[PDB]
Each structure stands twice: as C-alpha cells, then as structure tokens.
C-alpha cells in the first residue's frame, strides 16, 4: 500500500502539444542529425576515393566568383546546401593556418587569413555561408584555434564572440578554453610593446 503511493509517478500525464512545440521539436531534431554530420565521409561515399584545393581543382586561380561557382558544383554533387560546404571548407582551411607553427600567430598567418577572410565576406555578401554550421564546425576543431584568429573573426565581422560561444554544447569547455587563452595572454603583453598593443586591443575588446 505504502509501495503504491511511493511508485505513483506524478509526471504520467503528457497532453497533446501546441503546434509551435512540434516545430521546436523538428528544429532540435535537424540540429541533432547535422551535429553528427561530416562531409569528408560524404565525398568518399558519393564520389570515390576537402580544401579550397579540392573544390577549386588544385590551385586553378584565386578569383572569387570562380571559387563560388566551384562550391555550387561541389554542393550539386553532394546535394548538401552550398552554405554548409563553405562553412566546413573555411573551418578546415582555418585548422590548416592555425596548426602550422603562445596565443598569438603574428606573421604571414595574418596575410593568408586576411586573403581567406576577404573571400569569406564575398561569401557572406552572396549569402553562401551558413554562419551557425560555421560556429558548430569551429567547436569541432576547438583546440588548433588561437584567440588571435577568433578576434580577427569578431573584428572583420565573420562571427561575433557572442554568436560562437552561444553555439558551443559544453559551457564548461568554452569557460576553460577562454580561461587558458586569457591566462596565456595576460602572461604575454609584456613580451614586446608591438604584441602588447594588439593583445591590449583584443583584451579590451
């Protein structure tokens, strides 16, 4: 009898939902099925055995309209939207730059990154760029990344600090990630007055 009263689950009633909740449901569902998506695997699936190299066909030219029409052709093979390819291919070419050798990356990294980001704005102007497929494909990298790269993102208006960090699953991982980068920065910005200027700029930012 006491057994009954203790077993009796209060939350046994689930009413028919509001049709708004059904779309929220279908959105969190498509979010989930894509968070576990990869494109490299897709290219090995549909195409037989990805960088700017792959889509542009091994350094063909660096003309903006040309590389855009290359992402259209890639997306046509796959049947993924062009925004999704472009997000991934930039996040991949981001991994490239930030790996090849501490929080700042200050020489020539800046040059390739600026040429890259001036292409990213071309992408953003033709709207060929899912921002949030990009946020998610950065936190798939998460480790190669440096605070200098992310601050250029912010200031060149590709993402904002707030739009990236509010599309990270583990709020602790973001906290610890920044905590490390800020500690190494405040260690830095006495190494030289040149590096300290850029460091003080992004620290105030």
């Amino acid at each position: 009898r006491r057994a009954w009263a203790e077993l009796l689950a209060g939350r046994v009633k689930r009413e028919k939902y509001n049709p708004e909740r059904a779309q929220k449901l279908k959105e969190s569902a498509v979010r989930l099925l894509r968070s576990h998506q990869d494109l490299n695997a897709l290219l090995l699936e549909v195409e037989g055995p990805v960088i700017d190299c792959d889509s542009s066909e091994a350094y063909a030219n660096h003309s903006s309209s040309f590389i855009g029409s290359a992402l259209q052709d890639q997306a046509s093979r796959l049947g993924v939207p062009v925004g999704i390819l472009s997000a991934g291919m930039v996040a991949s070419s981001v991994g490239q730059i930030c790996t090849a050798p501490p929080v700042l990356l200050t020489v020539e990294q800046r040059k390739k990154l600026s040429s890259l980001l001036e292409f990213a704005q071309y992408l953003l102007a033709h709207s060929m760029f899912s921002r949030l497929s990009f946020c998610q494909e950065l936190w798939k990298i998460q480790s190669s990344l440096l605070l200098e790269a992310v601050w250029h993102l912010h200031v060149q208006g590709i993402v904002s600090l707030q739009e990236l960090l509010e599309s990270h699953p583990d709020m602790h991982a973001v906290g610890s990630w920044l905590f490390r980068n800020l500690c190494c920065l405040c260690e830095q910005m006495e190494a030289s007055c040149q590096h300290a200027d850029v460091a003080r700029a992004m620290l105030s930012d």
Binding site: L124, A125, S127, G157
Partner: protein, 88 residues
C-alpha cells in the same frame, strides 16, 4: 526541348498554343517557377486554365512581376545587413 538551351521548351501542339514557349525550373520539388512567353495575352490565359485543371488540388498559382519570392527576400535582408552595419 531545344538542345542548346534545354531549360526551354517549344509547344508543337497543332492548334491555338502553337509556338508558345515555356520554361520550367523546379526548386524544392513542391515549389516551381514557370515562365510563359506567348503570342498574345489570350493564349497566356488558355494555357493557365488547361494547366490549373491538371495540377494537384492545393496548387497555389500566383503572379510574379518583380523577382521570385525567395530572391526578393535575400535582396531585402542584404540591404539591411548592410544598412544596420553602416548604422553601427
């Protein structure tokens, strides 16, 4: 179909539509954009009648003067993305 431009078709039906030209682009195989180049505006009507009769039931025709609904919306949003950035 014209081979050289196979996004175009020419009517060969031997009565009142003859030589009318259409084009069809599908996008989201629900939604699609027909363009009709006709020889007068009668023949433009006779067409949509013959075709609203063979469509499915909820088939919401509706007339574009001024750019596809999708495109306009980007063209709008754009000119804010820039405006608001400029206002920032």
């Amino acid at each position: 179909i014209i081979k050289e431009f196979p996004e175009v078709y020419f009517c060969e039906r031997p009565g009142s539509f003859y030589g009318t030209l259409f084009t069809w682009k599908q996008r989201t195989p629900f939604e699609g954009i027909l363009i009709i180049y006709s020889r007068n505006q009668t023949v433009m009507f006779q067409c949509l009648h013959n075709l609203i009769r063979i469509l499915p039931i909820n088939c919401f025709l509706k007339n574009l003067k001024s750019g596809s609904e999708n495109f306009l919306i980007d063209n709008m949003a754009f000119t804010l993305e820039k405006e608001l950035v400029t206002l920032s």
